[PDB]
Design a protein around this ligand. Sequence first.
Ligand SMILES: NC(=O)C1=CN([C@@H]2O[C@H](COP(=O)(O)OP(=O)(O)OC[C@H]3O[C@@H](n4cnc5c(N)ncnc54)[C@H](OP(=O)(O)O)[C@@H]3O)[C@@H](O)[C@H]2O)C=CC1
Lengths: 63, 485, 120, 123, 263, 210, 123
Amino acid sequence: PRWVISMGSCANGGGYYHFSYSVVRGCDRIVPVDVYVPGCPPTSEALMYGVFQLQRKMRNTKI
Amino acid sequence: AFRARPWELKKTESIDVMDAVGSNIRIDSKGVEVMRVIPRVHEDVNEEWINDKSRFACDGLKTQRLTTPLIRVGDKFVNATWDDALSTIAKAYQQKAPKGDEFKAVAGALVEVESMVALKDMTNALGSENTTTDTPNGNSAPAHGITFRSNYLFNSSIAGIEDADAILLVGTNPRREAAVMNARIRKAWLRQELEIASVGPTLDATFDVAELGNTHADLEKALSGEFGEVLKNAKNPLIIVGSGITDREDAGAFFNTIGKFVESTPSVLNENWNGYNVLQRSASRAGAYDIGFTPSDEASKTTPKMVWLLGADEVAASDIPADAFVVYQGHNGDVGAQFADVVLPGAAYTEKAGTYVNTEGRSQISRAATGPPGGAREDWKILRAVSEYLGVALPYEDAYEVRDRLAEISPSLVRYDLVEPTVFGDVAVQHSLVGPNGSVTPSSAPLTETIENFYMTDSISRSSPTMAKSSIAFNKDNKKNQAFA
Amino acid sequence: SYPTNDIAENPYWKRDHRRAYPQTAFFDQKTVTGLLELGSEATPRIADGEAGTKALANIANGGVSFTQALGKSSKDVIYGEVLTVNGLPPVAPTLAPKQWKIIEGEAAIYPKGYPCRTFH
Amino acid sequence: AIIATAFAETVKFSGSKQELQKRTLALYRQFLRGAPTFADLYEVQFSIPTIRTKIRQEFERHRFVDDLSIQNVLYAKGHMEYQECINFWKQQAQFLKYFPEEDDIQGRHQPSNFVDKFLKNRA
Amino acid sequence: MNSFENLAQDVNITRSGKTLIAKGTGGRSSRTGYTATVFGANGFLGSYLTAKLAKHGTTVVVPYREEMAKRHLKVTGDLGVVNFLEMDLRNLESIDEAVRHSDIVVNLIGREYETKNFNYYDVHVEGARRIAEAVKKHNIARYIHVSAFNAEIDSPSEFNHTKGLGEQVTKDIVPWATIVRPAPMFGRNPVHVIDVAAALERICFDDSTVAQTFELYGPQKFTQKQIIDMVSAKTFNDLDLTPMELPDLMFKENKEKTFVHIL
Amino acid sequence: RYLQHVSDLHQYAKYIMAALPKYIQGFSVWKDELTLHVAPSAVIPVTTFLRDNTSTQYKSIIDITAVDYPSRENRFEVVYNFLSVRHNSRIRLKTYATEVTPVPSITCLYEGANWFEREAYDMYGVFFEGHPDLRRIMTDYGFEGHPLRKDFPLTGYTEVRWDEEKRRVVYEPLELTQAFRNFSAGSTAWEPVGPGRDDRPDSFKLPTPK
Amino acid sequence: VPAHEIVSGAPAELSRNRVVRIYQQAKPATQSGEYGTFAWRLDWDIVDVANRWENDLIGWQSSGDYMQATQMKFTSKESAIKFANKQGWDFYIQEPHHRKFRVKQYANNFVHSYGKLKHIRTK
Ligand SMILES: NC(=O)C1=CN([C@@H]2O[C@H](COP(=O)(O)OP(=O)(O)OC[C@H]3O[C@@H](n4cnc5c(N)ncnc54)[C@H](OP(=O)(O)O)[C@@H]3O)[C@@H](O)[C@H]2O)C=CC1
């Protein structure tokens, strides 16, 4: 029963390095991600708020 | 309005094909659409000046195109699978079965040399050289030789007009046809001492013509009366001819007087420069005659069962038969596509790297700026694949092999942007004189204007609304266009 | 501040430093032979301004060599412009030379027994 | 870094073609001898003879190279590839870069004639 | 570069009359133009199915029952390719909504046991009656109904009986639907599951598979004792496929004296 | 000070060329930076002279790299950077190397240098003959190409995604959702800077006659 | 000419499918500067299907061609052509078109015309 959240802008859709040769354009090509926390350095404010949104999703699952 | 800032634009260096000069443009593209064209500089042909119709007809490049093949069901087309249309063509070839001299293949105005080579190869391996051009009186040989390239080219160079002394135009309006040529004429006439006279319709030039008449009798009277002194006296004259007389069925008697005068007079025709000159109106009709793209005397007599339109926009309803299989290959919808049973979407001049030959004889390549939109393809590859569904296996499948076959027809077309002189011009004037001597009588039909409008021709300017409002805004009926009142 | 954007007397070209940039003084194998034999704009060894350019042009074409220029060089040339005036090789030069103190007493940041010294 | 890694050799450039031929010979022997290790190590689906015929056909690709120093760089690149493969540095998704034609057939309509190229305008 | 080994051409017409032009070269970022709805794509065959289907850029509409079984279907397609919207078999309106813009549509809704909510009659003939009545309502081209082997209309088993019933009802209401019957399936005679999904994608897109029942059975026939000892109509040849063999798939003194041991 | 010091640096480098005429082709100074212009078979003796002389003891490799100009027949130029921590001085050493010919490695002298040499190897494909552990670093293991090289595009040739079928990541040719749009097309069409003055001292430019 | 297409790590299709073009950039007709018209640009002719196409969500100009935004600058045509055939590409050198010298005088703006004026300057 697993989840993943994607912190930052380099980890979703490539980001600052989006046109580089040696980069994966976001971890959507690899892992199925459930919440995105955008921001290039997204403040601990925004990361924690992403975690609260993800906890709501986990509880509404009731697996 | 400008929609793209010039740091966003992608510049592409191509040739214009709307006019016969083949002037240099600069295609600016955001990436699927084309924003503008701007004159790249060339020392000889256009000298940083570009035509109006050359410039503002990128509007018709994106408004009424063909993005899929269509098949006529009866009073209404449907769009189709590519295989559907291209098997429909083979099935109707097997049904009609033209054995020979019944597959008409007419080209049109702005078409690549390589597409004309593909079409001509497909017709001649088919077994029919009913291989004609779009102009009225196109069904015959154009009363001047495919032989000896200096018959149908602009033989003194375009640079040579700067050296001209006293020139006369027949059957043309250089203000309309090849408008950059008029900037060359007026530049020469203003910098030096020149003498113009004109035979044809009463034209308004920028410069100062002298009128001579509206009749081939007026022509012969003018060549015998006072210009056998002027053209004989002149150091570097040139005699210059429209292609609107090849339109006329009485063309050959009009070639007789002028070729006999050039053969008689040794100043218009000598060693270092030739001065018989003609104009064209297209980028292809000066390059189609390099290939030999002309019908035979036997081919003009029959009625075709299967008509091929390649471009071919100014055809009439009477020019094709009623039972004919009339497949169109072009890049936008037009009168020519309205008659068709199958239309085939082709790439326009922007979307293909094509060879084009001007009136001077320069072979020049365009650069493909963007891809053909939706489901259009390149022009010669469509013929290369329709050949496979017929019995014709065209020997090439690669663009370099197209270049080598193109060298085999004539190797001054794989040599680009060089102008060569001709040592055969003296022989060519006599060989162009002998043919039409006594073949046809000069009738008194007055010399009409070659195009009724500048702004609406060549299958792109008909589709663009820029030309559609610029034709009615410049009609010179209104008080704003006229200088007085 | 204001003296940069005064309205009376500010031509841009006086306070201009992007255009008054230095160029890379690149020295060939051959222009150093020219420095050893022609001389210099400080100490020239060339008279006869018409035959000067002729004496210049063979070196500019590859007439003499550099080992030949060193063999033909006098001791005054070698001790003036190759070596130093005392016959010594020059020291690898540094822009702002740094002389070191060692702070030792109670002004140090570690007393005796800790191994860190606090140089200056 | 004083000591090198395990299977490395100092990159050194021969002046003759026969010495290079001896070195590429010993090199093919090293790949072919280490080929049973790669099937265990990278957990491939298939057989050791397919690894061996691939190593062979990757030396078939550069059989007719004339220039000496291009053979030299080609030997150095081949030794670097052996070096990565014989250890666990490459992973099993970069080892299978070498076998794209084996793992799966992508579907119908591999175009052969001009018509099949042309129905999807040379793909 | 990646090519459309999916397609036969670049410009294709569907049966209903819509014109579909493939853009660019085949690959993840491109769009084939087809819109596909796969009922049951959370399951075991539908996962491989819209792995192949959303690989080239067909906009896959995935109807889901549970929010957590669907998540690994997000990484098989590009931005905007795979699209999730919830539905239930019971609520008509969600079936109506899920097939509004589809070009092709498949179901693999198949359950081998009775629940407290659905018996065999409820998921196989009656759910298929429901969604294929919606397919007839919207005139969607190319409907495909995957069924079971041994799908007889009248049988002692209720599963096989109701699979035959679902076939007959969907053939009754839609004449142009195609019903495919695969063998037993072994993803990781029986047929390998990537072969079933390859066969289904080759069913999906061409003409002249219409109203044709298909048998998708592997090369050589087995018994259960033989399988456990190894562990210890139109066929594939219509659509130019060779199924993989089950046996090949089935796996898927002195030196010590001169070393040192106590240091 | 600074005018005197740059005029002193000129003279030091004139001495360095005169001490080793067989190996040093040129020297150029530009603003308290000294570049020594050296043949590729001339690397090792000049670097021993830079390590070993007491006037010239640089002792410490800082960073080395290549730079390609594709418009020259010898494509890459391999530049070395040293730091005399005694004399508080920096020095620079440029050689050249084509894609296929080498330059010899200074890892026999400088112990830090080998890691730098294989870095410049992976970025440029420039060879260091005489080097243990020459192979790639800081790129992908199966990566084909040399990235910091003008024929190599920006986004590269390949991209990575998880194929569901093979249950592994697969490597595929490049497809973008948004194409790269360089805005370098749209630079100035007037010359942006002048030629600029010189910092050559009067002693080291050629005399005019008379 | 040493064939360097096998050493640069580029795929085969970049050497055996695509045509490339040498050109000097023309002088812009809009503005009168000439600074960008001295270096020789090496640039790839577009491919039919993989140039650019509109995205369905926003309308992003997605591409499939990967050399679409690469250009090179060379000093001379000879360096450009030696690099182009050293990497094993098929070029097309486009020769530059300069302006023609013509003597200008400000005293051309008025001369005594003996016949018809045929022109009226304005300044
Ligand atoms: N050996 C085999 O595997 C055989 C299977 N088949 C048939 O092929 C098809 C796919 O094969 P297989 O992978 O085994 O089947 P699945 O494991 O995929 O069946 C489950 C899928 O169908 C959905 N499903 C079942 N009932 C319902 C329902 N009332 N409402 C919504 N969804 C429902 C499930 O929803 P959810 O995701 O919520 O669970 C799930 O998506 C099936 O129809 C099967 O009958 C054919 C012959 C043999």
